[PDB]
Amino acid sequence: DIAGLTPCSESKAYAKLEKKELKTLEKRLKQYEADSAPAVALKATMERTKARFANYAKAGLLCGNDGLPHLIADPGLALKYGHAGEVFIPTFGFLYVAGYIGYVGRQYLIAVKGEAKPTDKEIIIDVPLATKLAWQGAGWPLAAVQELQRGTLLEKEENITVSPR
Amino acid sequence: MKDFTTYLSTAPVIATIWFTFTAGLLIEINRYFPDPLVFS
Amino acid sequence: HFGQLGIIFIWLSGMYFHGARFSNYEAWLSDPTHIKPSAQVVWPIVGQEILNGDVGGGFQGIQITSGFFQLWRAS
Amino acid sequence: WTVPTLNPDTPSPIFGGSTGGLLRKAQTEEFYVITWEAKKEQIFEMPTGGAAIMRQGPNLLKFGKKEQCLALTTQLRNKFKLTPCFYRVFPDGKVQYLHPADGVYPEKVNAGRVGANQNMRRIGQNVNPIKVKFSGRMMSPAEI
Amino acid sequence: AHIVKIYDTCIGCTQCVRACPLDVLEMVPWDGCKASQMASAPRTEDCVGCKRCETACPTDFLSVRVYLGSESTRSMGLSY
Amino acid sequence: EVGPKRGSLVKILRPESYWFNQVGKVVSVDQSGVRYPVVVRFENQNYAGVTTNNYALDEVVAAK
Amino acid sequence: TKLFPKFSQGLAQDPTTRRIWYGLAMAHDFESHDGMTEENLYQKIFASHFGQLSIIFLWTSGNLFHVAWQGNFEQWVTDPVHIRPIAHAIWDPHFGQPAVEAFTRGGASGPVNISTSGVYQWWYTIGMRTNQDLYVGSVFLALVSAIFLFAGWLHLQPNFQPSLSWFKDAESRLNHHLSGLFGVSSLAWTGHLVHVAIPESRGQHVGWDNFLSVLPHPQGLTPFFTGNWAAYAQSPDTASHVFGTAQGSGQAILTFLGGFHPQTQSLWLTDMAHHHLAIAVIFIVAGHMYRTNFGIGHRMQAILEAHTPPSGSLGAGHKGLFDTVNNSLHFQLGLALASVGTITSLVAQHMYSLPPYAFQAIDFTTQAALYTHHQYIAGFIMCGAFAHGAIFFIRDYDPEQNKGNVLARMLDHKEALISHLSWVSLFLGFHTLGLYVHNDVMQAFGTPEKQILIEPVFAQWIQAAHGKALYGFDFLLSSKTSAAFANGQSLWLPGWLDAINNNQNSLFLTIGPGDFLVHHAIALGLHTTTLILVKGALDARGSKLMPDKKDFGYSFPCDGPGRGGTCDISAYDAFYLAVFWMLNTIGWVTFYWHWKHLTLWQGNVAQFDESSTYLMGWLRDYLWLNSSQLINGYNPFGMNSLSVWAWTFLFGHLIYATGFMFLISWRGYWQELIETLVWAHEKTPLANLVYWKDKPVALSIVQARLVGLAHFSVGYIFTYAAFLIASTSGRFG
Amino acid sequence: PFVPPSWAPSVFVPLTGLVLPAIAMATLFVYIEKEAP
Numbered sequence A: 001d002i003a004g005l006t007p008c009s010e011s012k013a014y015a016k017l018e019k020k021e022l023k024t025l026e027k028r029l030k031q032y033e034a035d036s037a038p039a040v041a042l043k044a045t046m047e048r049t050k051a052r053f054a055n056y057a058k059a060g061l062l063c064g065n066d067g068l069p070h071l072i073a074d075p076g077l078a079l080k081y082g083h084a085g086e087v088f089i090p091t092f093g094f095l096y097v098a099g100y101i102g103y104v105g106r107q108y109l110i111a112v113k114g115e116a117k118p119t120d121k122e123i124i125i126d127v128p129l130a131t132k133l134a135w136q137g138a139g140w141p142l143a144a145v146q147e148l149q150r151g152t153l154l155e156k157e158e159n160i161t162v163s164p165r
Numbered sequence B: 001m002k003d004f005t006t007y008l009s010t011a012p013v014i015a016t017i018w019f020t021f022t023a024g025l026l027i028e029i030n031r032y033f034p035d036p037l038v039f040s
Numbered sequence C: 001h002f003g004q005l006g007i008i009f010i011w012l013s014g015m016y017f018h019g020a021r022f023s024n025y026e027a028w029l030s031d032p033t034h035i036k037p038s039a040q041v042v043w044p045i046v047g048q049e050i051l052n053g054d055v056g057g058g059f060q061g062i063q064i065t066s067g068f069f070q071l072w073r074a075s
Numbered sequence D: 001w002t003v004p005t006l007n008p009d010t011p012s013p014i015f016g017g018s019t020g021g022l023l024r025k026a027q028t029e030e031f032y033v034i035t036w037e038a039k040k041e042q043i044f045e046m047p048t049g050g051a052a053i054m055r056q057g058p059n060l061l062k063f064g065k066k067e068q069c070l071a072l073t074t075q076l077r078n079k080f081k082l083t084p085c086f087y088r089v090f091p092d093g094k095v096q097y098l099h100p101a102d103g104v105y106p107e108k109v110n111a112g113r114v115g116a117n118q119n120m121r122r123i124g125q126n127v128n129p130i131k132v133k134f135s136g137r138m139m140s141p142a143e144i
Numbered sequence E: 001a002h003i004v005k006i007y008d009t010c011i012g013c014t015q016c017v018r019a020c021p022l023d024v025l026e027m028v029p030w031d032g033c034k035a036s037q038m039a040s041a042p043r044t045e046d047c048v049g050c051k052r053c054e055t056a057c058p059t060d061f062l063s064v065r066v067y068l069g070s071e072s073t074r075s076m077g078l079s080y
Numbered sequence F: 001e002v003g004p005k006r007g008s009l010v011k012i013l014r015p016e017s018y019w020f021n022q023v024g025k026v027v028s029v030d031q032s033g034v035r036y037p038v039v040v041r042f043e044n045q046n047y048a049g050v051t052t053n054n055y056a057l058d059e060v061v062a063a064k
Numbered sequence G: 001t002k003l004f005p006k007f008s009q010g011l012a013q014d015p016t017t018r019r020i021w022y023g024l025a026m027a028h029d030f031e032s033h034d035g036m037t038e039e040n041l042y043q044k045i046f047a048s049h050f051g052q053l054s055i056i057f058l059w060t061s062g063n064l065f066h067v068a069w070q071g072n073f074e075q076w077v078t079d080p081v082h083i084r085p086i087a088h089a090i091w092d093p094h095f096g097q098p099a100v101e102a103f104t105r106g107g108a109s110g111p112v113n114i115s116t117s118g119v120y121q122w123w124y125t126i127g128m129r130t131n132q133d134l135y136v137g138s139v140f141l142a143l144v145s146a147i148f149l150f151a152g153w154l155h156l157q158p159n160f161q162p163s164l165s166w167f168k169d170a171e172s173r174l175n176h177h178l179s180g181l182f183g184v185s186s187l188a189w190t191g192h193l194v195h196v197a198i199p200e201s202r203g204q205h206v207g208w209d210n211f212l213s214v215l216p217h218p219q220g221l222t223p224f225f226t227g228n229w230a231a232y233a234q235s236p237d238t239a240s241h242v243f244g245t246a247q248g249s250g251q252a253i254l255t256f257l258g259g260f261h262p263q264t265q266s267l268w269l270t271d272m273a274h275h276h277l278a279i280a281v282i283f284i285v286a287g288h289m290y291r292t293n294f295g296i297g298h299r300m301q302a303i304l305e306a307h308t309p310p311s312g313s314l315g316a317g318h319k320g321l322f323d324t325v326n327n328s329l330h331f332q333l334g335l336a337l338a339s340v341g342t343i344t345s346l347v348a349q350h351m352y353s354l355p356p357y358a359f360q361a362i363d364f365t366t367q368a369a370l371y372t373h374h375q376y377i378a379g380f381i382m383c384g385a386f387a388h389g390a391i392f393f394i395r396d397y398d399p400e401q402n403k404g405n406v407l408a409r410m411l412d413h414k415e416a417l418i419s420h421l422s423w424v425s426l427f428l429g430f431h432t433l434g435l436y437v438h439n440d441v442m443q444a445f446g447t448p449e450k451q452i453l454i455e456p457v458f459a460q461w462i463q464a465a466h467g468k469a470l471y472g473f474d475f476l477l478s479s480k481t482s483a484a485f486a487n488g489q490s491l492w493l494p495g496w497l498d499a500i501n502n503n504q505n506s507l508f509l510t511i512g513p514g515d516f517l518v519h520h521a522i523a524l525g526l527h528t529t530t531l532i533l534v535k536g537a538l539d540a541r542g543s544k545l546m547p548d549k550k551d552f553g554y555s556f557p558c559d560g561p562g563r564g565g566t567c568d569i570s571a572y573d574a575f576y577l578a579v580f581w582m583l584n585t586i587g588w589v590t591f592y593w594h595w596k597h598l599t600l601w602q603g604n605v606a607q608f609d610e611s612s613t614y615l616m617g618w619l620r621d622y623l624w625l626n627s628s629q630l631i632n633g634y635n636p637f638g639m640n641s642l643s644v645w646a647w648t649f650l651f652g653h654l655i656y657a658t659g660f661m662f663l664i665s666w667r668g669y670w671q672e673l674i675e676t677l678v679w680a681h682e683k684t685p686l687a688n689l690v691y692w693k694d695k696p697v698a699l700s701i702v703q704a705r706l707v708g709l710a711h712f713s714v715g716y717i718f719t720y721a722a723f724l725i726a727s728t729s730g731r732f733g
Numbered sequence H: 001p002f003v004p005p006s007w008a009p010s011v012f013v014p015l016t017g018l019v020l021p022a023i024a025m026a027t028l029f030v031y032i033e034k035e036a037p
């Protein structure tokens, strides 16, 4: 398929891998009773193992000669062949959360700079203010862009200290 | 009580609660959606 | 120093409690030479349940090297 | 104020002795002598290690380097409120006096002192190292 | 011998002179500051380079600077 | 009659200062013709723990 | 006062042992010597370069002499596949009889060392066939060494010392070095290949005794002067040619076959002849570019002055840079090390994948040593390139003469440069380490299918563009309908495509997820090492913590415990910290090269593909698995030929660990300990009769960092060299 | 003509490993300790 890979659902090595893991679990099972606590736990593990291998095949992943899933990172190849969920979609999932955390922290830091004693507002968190800013961060991408266009996102070069040069 | 709630607002106490919450959420998600590898 | 003593008692209490609730001590008493002492059990999350090894006595858990089973038997 | 003259026969404190004293340097290059007056017999700490009792009246000690003499001077002034003075003595018998150079301790401003190694500029107004290059020796811009 | 320089930002606090453990520095009269006194370095041949004087200077940047130079028995702080 | 007013905010222009391009509060200005009459206080300490320093008239400018 | 060192009165007046150490360590810093002038500085450097050249040709002479005297070159040339080359003989009186027998091998008279430098394959390829060929070369290079040494003496004499302006004639030196040093040397080397090397590869002897009566080509120079240059490319060596013999050979002397000789698995000699002829023409032409005494050509100052973008994006542009470069030797040395350092890496990259010497590929130990050798040397040269760039800023940079040009503007946004290098290093480290740890946890819990394996699609896409058809991209040279495929289909693609699609050679090895992780670790190494070195240079002249750092020099201990503490604040210390990251980076590169090749050489590439995605595989399947033979070189039952590498392996660990002492424990502890030793000696009877002349003292703060770094580096190198050779040679050799 | 005698290592190895180093160290030790006129 892509880069010589093949769908895991059609991969011989992938299928053989599932048998090896289930065989290992089954070997430990036969040293216990039918419905003892250890036996139930082992059976639960085997169910998750079977579900995991079905899910990855159902997801249409690609397996190499190793018979293990490989991920596609190029946006063009991902959207071309329906691998957007491996790296492309999770890319924009992380950035939203990462920007959320960073934007919320920046809002709080600016908020307390106006207080009389900013340092004491950092070791001892102002929880009522932090919760207020935590919820308003859901719209950070909109607020972040508008700050950039209005020119209030960055400090002036003349207001930043620098070493002799 | 005002001072006690002030103590709970100190950085080490907040971080413990926050990460205890954050870790619990991630642990619980993986308990009900085991083995997530692809968004799908 | 009272705080240090109080902490040791919580620690000692935990060791005795985990022996009662999460151990194969009773099975170990019957077959001490074949059953491995174990007093810690892990939850089945993110696939960490493999650490619950086969220790004997129809029990799965982490094998302990603290020697608490031998101390309890002697007493 | 006039430069004091050292008296080699001045009595010394009651001290058993230690292995932290003078070495062969004192016999070949130089050593240092500190003298002071004691109001009463008292125990002080030797910079070389141990405790010694100062006799009432004049006292004299010999040390291997200048810093040891000025370390004892700080102890005597701060705790016992004394006024010690020490010299540099050479093996040839010459004696050089210092601290206080002019009789007044340097912390206190005194008329008649001439400023030395004073630059009438800031640190940020020194020239660049390139401008003092090939001056015959490694020279910092601060020197010129 | 090390090099010790006093710059015209000195405020005459005398802290450098007190800090020096070898009596290298001293205070002299001056008219360039409120205290009317300035630090001086007349005995740099006894300087060891500890830089306790720089630790004690309040001015920013420092008004007393030590440039470690040629070594000797005195500057190397040897008693042997 | 020389220098900025007491309590006003000034911006430091000494490149070798810890507070270069930073704003501080004027505490007093010496009128005796000394080299560095202006005294400025800062809310953030420098690497030595100091929060005050003396500056010349031309090394400080009014906020903005 | 003491005489030594004669070049510094400050050191000569020091009564302590620091005088001895510092006298050695400042010998070659001519700029810091007493009474030095600019003109005398250049004449000393010119003389020193003659000394270096004489050592190089003498070192080469020694190699030629010992192989001929004690090697088995004449036997090796007969059957290079199944004979181990001999480096030199061993005469160690400490050896026991089992050791003497163990090291006797290759049909030698007595104990010998096996060569790993590849000189046998190199010399055999260029036409050497007998021991007398090597003897004449050895005497010739010993003579050349003497001549350069004499020239070093000659140009120090009163009437032969060049003036200062002579060393600053940039246009004339570039014209000569490009056309003569590069161009003519490459043209001369083409002459050797056409006249000597190629005929020797076809079974015809050509030496100084008969080369004037032997025709390199059947048509002698008629094609050359008539423009029919294609005649020289007709009837090349066939695929059945047996190297060194006339069976299967051809007649062409200039070709573009583009592949590997089927038997020797190395580049064709007729391609290497046409290669050197081609660049020689380019270099000779390129050497007529600059102004001289004849009224034509460019003046480099004019070129720099012109290139200022009209929009002011680069400020003043390149105005004033000619004097900045022409007057500073540290700027020139930094450019020379940076350029040479990169080319050393390029040599390593291209020599393992395009082996130019016959039978080089099959000698696995030689290939491993050659790649590791040059990559570690490149790493050191790159660190030096930045060190001397930092020295330039402190010593030679003049802000007034560089006002507003590109160089000055680099200091203007140095925080931006350093901040972004910091971000890239953090990003690569977090995600590179994180993915490895994720894959390790998955393997530990027995779920190898849950790990994150990212296909190197971008790199696999490049391999497709070059003709590797495995990935099915059908791109450019991988597609038989593209114009790129068609145009080159008659010149070099048939040979190139045949080689790139052969999976038994190292030409564009197949890559997978294991290669993805390692490459991103290499990027982390390059960026972090650059971060440390770049910070050391841009902050060399000063910083907020030390605004006037330039007044103290390139290398000083510290500024004391005031202002919070200033340990390792000089630009010298930034280089010192960067050497650690350089070793770490080159280590990752050489581990990656070695493991990927061991699996290839054993045919089991699957091991690397499977075990390289988590860090336990490296520790288990590479370091632990391949140490089995090394550490058995000597054991309670006996010893074998690997006992020298086993001994050297532990020898490296010891020097490495000793370096920790100089890096962890600092001076104050040791100076106070030495003071009781001085007391003990003076009070001891029968020993205080003897006395010292230099007062014992502890090493300095700066010295111990260098001494600790030297032990760290030496132990680093010797440990891996012993393991690299022992694991590779024992496995196959 | 070039081939050295078979006994060359027996002489040169001790000479360059034990003898010349001894003279070199003695030369260097005396040189560094030498005092200026």
Ligand code: CLA
Binding pocket: A074, A075, A076, A077, A080, G457, G458, G461
């Ligand atoms: C990190 C850099 C990078 C690299 C090395 C590649 C590499 C590749 N991309 Mg990807 N791509 C990237 C980033 C990158 N991409 C980004 C950031 C985006 C936007 C989110 C895309 C969007 C994208 C699309 C929409 C497509 C590719 C495709 C490709 C492949 C061929 C064309 C190409 O991009 O040539 C080298 C890459 C560059 C010079 C960088 C810019 C590439 C642009 C954005 C896309 C060019 C598409 C091209 C015009 C398609 C023509 C048809 C093709 C079959 C020949 C190649 C494997 C094509 C594919 O799937 O081929 C099989 C394709 O259709 N890429």
Ligand code: CLA
Binding pocket: G045, G046, G049, G050, G053, G166, G167, G169, G172, G173, G176, G177, G180, G181, G182, G185
């Ligand atoms: C044609 C005239 C000519 C020639 C031949 C040279 C030659 C040389 N000059 Mg120059 N020089 C000239 C004119 C010339 N000069 C003029 C006119 C001036 C006055 C303006 C100068 C002023 C001058 C100075 C001031 C200095 C030199 C120096 C040198 C030496 C540089 C070091 C060296 O050997 O590099 C050899 C380099 C190469 C052979 C090429 C290296 C780059 C290639 C690409 C590397 C890879 C090639 C190949 C793959 C390697 C194969 C390896 C093998 C093991 C297989 C070199 C011998 C320096 C020196 O050492 O003096 C003693 C020096 O200090 N020259």
Ligand code: CLA
Binding pocket: G024, G025, G026, G027, G028, G029, G030, G333, G337, G380, G381, G383, G384, G385, G387, G388, G391, G554, G555, G572, G575, G710, G714
């Ligand atoms: C052709 C390139 C070149 C040249 C001409 C120079 C020239 C110079 N360099 Mg530079 N340098 C280079 C390459 C070069 N460098 C490289 C590759 C690096 C990176 C490693 C550096 C890093 C560097 C630094 C960090 C410094 C210099 C400095 C200097 C100056 C003084 C050198 C000195 O006194 O050494 C004296 C030599 C020694 C004290 C001993 C050197 C040998 C070392 C310690 C390793 C020894 C290993 C040992 C042999 C192993 C034994 C193994 C055992 C088993 C037997 C001088 C102008 C110094 C200077 O003053 O700059 C302004 C300086 O600070 N260089």
Ligand code: CLA
Binding pocket: G422, G425, G426, G427, G428, G429, G430, G433, G528, G531, G532, G577, G578, G580, G581
């Ligand atoms: C294995 C050893 C090691 C490691 C891991 C690092 C790591 C780092 N070094 Mg260091 N360094 C080392 C050895 C090491 N160094 C040595 C021997 C030297 C010679 C003195 C140096 C000299 C040096 C210099 C001079 C510089 C660095 C820099 C860096 C950073 C590079 C960027 C990076 O990877 O960011 C990613 C970060 C990491 C990989 C660090 C580890 C992160 C861990 C895994 C996080 C775990 C968190 C988790 C919740 C558990 C917490 C538990 C705890 C609360 C109990 C990073 C912090 C550069 C820097 O600071 O750049 C910004 C830099 O300038 N290093």
Ligand code: CLA
Binding pocket: G093, G094, H013, H014, H016, H017, H018
């Ligand atoms: C290249 C350097 C080198 C050489 C040639 C030798 C040679 C020797 N070493 Mg080794 N050694 C070296 C370096 C070297 N060593 C180093 C660097 C170290 C420190 C790591 C050691 C530590 C060491 C130890 C600890 C021992 C040796 C011993 C030996 C001897 C082993 C063979 C034997 O049975 O001798 C038997 C020796 C003889 C039959 C006598 C040989 C001639 C004697 C030693 C000198 C005669 C001098 C003569 C009468 C008058 C002066 C002549 C002169 C002016 C020409 C041999 C003499 C062993 C030994 O026996 O030492 C005495 C021994 O115990 N070495």
Ligand SMILES: CC1=C(/C=C/C(C)=C/C=C/C(C)=C/C=C/C=C(C)/C=C/C=C(C)/C=C/C2=C(C)CCCC2(C)C)C(C)(C)CCC1
Binding pocket: G330, G331, G333, G334, G335, G338, G342, G385, G386, G388, G389, G390, G392, G534, G537
């Ligand atoms: C700090 C400093 C310094 C230093 C620096 C350095 C050390 C640097 C380095 C640098 C480097 C080291 C760089 C590199 C670069 C590179 C590059 C830039 C490359 C490029 C390439 C290309 C462009 C290619 C292309 C191609 C391809 C890819 C394929 C096909 C072919 C071709 C050709 C097309 C100095 C001395 C100046 C002084 C001042 C300061």
Ligand code: SF4
Binding pocket: E006, E009, E010, E011, E012, E013, E014, E015, E016, E017, E038, E039, E056, E057, E058, E059, E063, E064
């Ligand atoms: S140098 Fe500094 S510490 Fe000394 S008197 Fe001047 S301001 Fe005070």
Ligand code: SF4
Binding pocket: E004, E019, E020, E021, E022, E023, E024, E025, E046, E047, E048, E049, E050, E051, E052, E053, E054, E066
């Ligand atoms: S460096 Fe030390 S000895 Fe020298 S002047 Fe400063 S405090 Fe005194």
